[PDB]
Design an enzyme around this catalytic site. Structure first.
Site, PDB file in Angstrom:
ATOM      1  N   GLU A  18      30.893  37.335  30.072  1.00 13.76           N
ATOM      2  CA  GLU A  18      31.884  38.428  30.529  1.00 13.76           C
ATOM      3  C   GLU A  18      31.313  39.896  30.079  1.00 13.76           C
ATOM      4  OE1 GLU A  18      34.616  38.708  32.235  1.00 13.76           O
ATOM      5  OE2 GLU A  18      35.229  36.620  32.463  1.00 13.76           O
TER       6      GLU A  18
ATOM      7  N   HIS B 299      30.314  39.435  34.754  1.00 16.87           N
ATOM      8  CA  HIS B 299      31.527  39.847  35.099  1.00 16.87           C
ATOM      9  C   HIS B 299      31.625  40.102  36.617  1.00 16.87           C
ATOM     10  CE1 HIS B 299      35.444  41.598  33.936  1.00 16.87           C
ATOM     11  NE2 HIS B 299      35.130  42.578  34.440  1.00 16.87           N
TER      12      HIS B 299
ATOM     13  N   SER C  35      39.199  41.764  36.822  1.00 16.02           N
ATOM     14  CA  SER C  35      39.110  42.819  35.853  1.00 16.02           C
ATOM     15  C   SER C  35      40.332  43.701  35.875  1.00 16.02           C
ATOM     16  CB  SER C  35      37.730  43.693  36.263  1.00 16.02           C
ATOM     17  OG  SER C  35      37.401  44.447  35.228  1.00 16.02           O
TER      18      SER C  35
END
Ligand SMILES: CCN1CCC[C@@H]1CNC(=O)c1cc([N+](=O)[O-])c(N(C)C)cc1OC
Ligand SMILES: CCN1CCC[C@@H]1CNC(=O)c1cc([N+](=O)[O-])c(N(C)C)cc1OC
Lengths: 533, 535
Positions: B327, B440, B203
């Protein structure tokens, strides 16, 4: 003097001719006049009813072809020549043709009326591919086809003027439809069951009869093959028509009245010589003189009219061929030819797109390119070629057809849709062109039933299937065989399920969504784009 | 010393350390936790570049994680493990610049390749001390030397008045770089090899890694790079100098505050007050947007990451990059009406149109229209299940998947050796709803080998899967190639190229090779949308 070949219509007596179809005889009445010849001061004018005649009019032969441009791209090539006029050109061309069973139907038989295509600039009811004898003999149909004026003679308009109001070519069709109402019973036809069918511009014409009130009492059902009244090529605005006419006038050395009077003195071929020179952009699938939004024949744009109309009373059959666009590429796009595989480069693809989508802004043209590029193989010539065809076909036929089908179904109409996927074994165009625009027609008309034509036996069986769907649709508004369980059935197209069928050698297969994602791009997004940018 | 474990005493440039012997499933590892690498960035040093830690006297005890950097604490679902696993697990403090080292026990004989972890958390949160970042498994099973550092987040790390002396911006990134420098000087004391240093992060950690690649001074501090579910390019990882200035001064206003006086007043505010207002300075209602992130200062970042990746020469670069299957899903519950972890989040077409405005906050009406048109399924434009999944896809594609595709594409076309993956296994232990798929952040625990810990309840296949992933990552760190030299029987992981666009699936099954990373859709985000912006 065979009594079967003798008919009295309102205008007088006719003599037809007994023709041979593979499985029997048919009666054919060819070259029947439905209007006063539109010549001299009648050029550009609405048609007038044919004056009565004395004695027996000879109706055994095809009449002249309406004056038109003649294709010269591939001189002597069967693929192009099959669409070229096969009788003498003349402005004296308003005649129709009737085929019936021999002997003539004992009871009133459903009538099918064919309206040819040819981009509104060409075509004739006398071509071999429109031979009505097969449908007459095998299916017992009464089949009618008219000539109607094309190019300048049929669609040159100075909107608002008295002497070139536009759309007279469509008024020719309508007059011929009126003739069928008043006369067709004498041949055994049922005026209360009339089905229009047509291909390409002929389909667009059928569409305009649907959208024009005075036509609506002249037929009951409609078939539109590979063409629609809505879409980019089939109409022009009053202003763009006026523009093209005065430009043509200038080009041939010519206040509306005086402009038109000078145009009326020009030999026919002088007009044709400059026909193609009035288009706003370099383009393909675009034609100079087409129906005009006059606020008369067409009270509003076809787009507007289909969006707001009530179609509760209408049954329609509509469809496309597998490769709508391929044909047109060799008529304007660098890199394409019938003689090589036309494998193109990426640069030639972006070039093709501005030509195939001539009214597109830079941004819109970029949108098209990016949508149609296969990003796994961005530069592959084969993909790029096939994509170029898809763009042209989608933009001009498939998506305009998906749009029409959807509006009609949503506003009450009974709709059936198809995609025609069989490539004729006898086809003369290269393989890369696939199933090109116009090559379903010979199957619908049943030409493979003629043994001398060399179609395969599977093809002959196929043609018989199609003639059944079409004539069943003519009879009932439903193409499904009423004497047939198992098929499976051809379901109506609806906005919910979006079902249509593939027509090919294998049995009907039901599919859903007619290029749904791609037609959302054309029908929903691009408009928003261009109207801003 | 005298009666301590002689294997746990180490000296670095600043002085002597005592570490701790930790148990990993297969044996002990050495850990040195809470090593200071900067002077505490407190008081007059808030918003300032870090200064190297000054030597200490005696033996610094390095047996426990140090403070977490002052940050917003997530309270969307209080007590829920799915959110709590990412929250601070030590005291919050501006005195937080510490790093951690795990190594085999006893420490390695020959110099060992070093992995440096950079945590994610939208640049507003995160800590190197979280359980999912536990370095013990990689150290024990692969013999890796693993380093992770805390770096300032939120205002403390990224509030910028560009051009000023007192708040130059990107100081959180300079914290990271200071820790990379610390590794260069000191890691050999632990048996680590300063000449084989691989950065990895997820990230915002991943975006950080990408920015070290694009920042010249960082380039001599590492040799290879892994970017998981994040990129320095894209819509959230950087802001313009003007936008940062705008956010800094707004935040100043909200807390009651010439750049020098403004910053001087900010330095008098309690840390918590800054945190309490940081979400309030965003330009639009949005998700996947964070208030204080790296700024294009023309210094650390000489130009936009987009410009730098477009025109850089990357011959010397070896890079592993990838994404998880879903995601976007996680982000939807933080602000798209209709979405919740506690129900199926089936939504209506109207909620979809609204979600798109929030998930693509910078889009004009026409652009949002293009997005809705593209992602609508036109056979079932109204189906709530499809609309739910499309909303997630919009958010994932826009923020992660397409920026990663863009990055892999430019890097490959320009010399770099690139390996690409999509991670598709949903943890059997996931506490988020099934509708979220593989969200995610949920590959991280597998890369770090948590499933090897018997007490965590992973399945035996997950344990075996974790071991494979640890192998890929350490092989790549060691050689710049994820593939095992010996094991050629196992399917191979090809480099990603513009010509073939190949990438692998990471799941319970053997590697499968695929082509095109959402090629069509990413063409929409990466080639078309930007032009709909020049209009
Ligand atoms: C029936 C075959 N002919 C066409 O459809 C045709 C089409 C176009 N066109 O516009 O793509 C064209 N020009 C001049 C551009 C000429 C054509 O034939 C002469
Ligand atoms: C883990 N937590 C997140 O990723 C997270 C994400 C967003 N976000 O940017 O969508 C957000 N807001 C306020 C919009 C808040 C969040 O946690 C507080």
């Amino acid at each position: 003097e065979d009594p079967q070949l003798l008919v009295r219509v309102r205008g007088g007596q006719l003599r037809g001719i007994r023709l041979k179809a593979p499985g029997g005889p048919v009666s054919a009445f060819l070259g029947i006049p439905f209007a006063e010849p539109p010549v001299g001061s009648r050029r550009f004018m609405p048609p007038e009813p044919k004056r009565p005649w004395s004695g027996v009019l000879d109706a055994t032969t095809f009449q002249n072809v309406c004056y038109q441009y003649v294709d010269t791209l591939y001189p002597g090539f069967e693929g192009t020549e099959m669409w070229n006029p096969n009788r003498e050109l003349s402005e004296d061309c308003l005649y129709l043709n009737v085929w019936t069973p021999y002997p003539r139907p004992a009871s009133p038989t459903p009538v099918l009326i064919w309206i040819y295509g040819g981009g509104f600039y060409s075509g004739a009811a006398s071509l071999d591919v429109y031979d009505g004898r097969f449908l007459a003999q095998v299916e017992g149909a009464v089949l009618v086809s008219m000539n109607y004026r094309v190019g300048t003679f049929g669609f040159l308009a100075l909107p608002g003027s008295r002497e070139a109001p536009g759309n007279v070519g469509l008024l020719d069709q309508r007059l011929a439809l009126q003739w069928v109402q008043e006369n067709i019973a004498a041949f055994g036809g049922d005026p209360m069951s009339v089905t229009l069918f047509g291909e390409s511009a002929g389909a667009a014409s059928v569409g305009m009869h649907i959208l024009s009130l005075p036509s609506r009492s002249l037929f009951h059902r409609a078939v539109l093959q590979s063409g629609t009244p809505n879409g980019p090529w089939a109409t022009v605005s009053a202003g763009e028509a006026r523009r093209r006419a005065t430009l043509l006038a200038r080009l041939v050395g010519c206040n509306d009245t005086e402009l038109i009077a000078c145009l009326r003195t020009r030999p026919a071929q002088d007009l044709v010589d400059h026909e193609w020179h009035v288009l706003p952009q370099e383009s393909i699938f675009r034609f100079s003189f087409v129906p005009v939004v006059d606020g008369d024949f067409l009270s509003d744009t076809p787009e507007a009219l289909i969006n707001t109309g009530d179609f509760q009373d209408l049954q329609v059959l509509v469809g496309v061929v597998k490769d709508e666009g391929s044909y047109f590429l060799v008529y304007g796009v660098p890199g394409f030819s019938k003689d090589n595989e036309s494998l193109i480069s990426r640069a030639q693809f972006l070039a093709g797109v501005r030509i195939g989508v001539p009214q597109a802004s830079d941004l819109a043209a970029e949108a098209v390119v990016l949508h149609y590029t296969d990003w796994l193989h961005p530069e592959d010539p084969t993909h790029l070629r096939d994509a170029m065809s898809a763009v042209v076909g989608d933009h001009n036929v498939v998506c305009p057809v998906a749009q029409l089908a959807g509006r009609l179904a949503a506003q009450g109409a009974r709709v059936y849709a198809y995609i025609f996927e069989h490539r004729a074994s006898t086809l003369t165009w290269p393989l890369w062109m696939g199933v090109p625009h116009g090559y379903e027609i010979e199957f619908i008309f049943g030409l493979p039933l003629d043994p001398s034509l060399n179609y395969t036996t599977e093809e002959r069986i196929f043609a018989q299937r199609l003639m059944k769907y079409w004539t069943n649709f003519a009879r009932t508004g439903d193409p499904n065989d009423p004497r047939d369980s198992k098929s499976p059935q051809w379901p109506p197209y609806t906005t919910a399920a979006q079902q249509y069928v593939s027509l090919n050698l294998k049995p009907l297969e039901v599919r859903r969504g007619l290029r749904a994602q791609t037609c959302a791009f054309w029908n929903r997004f691009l408009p928003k784009l261009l109207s801003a940018t």
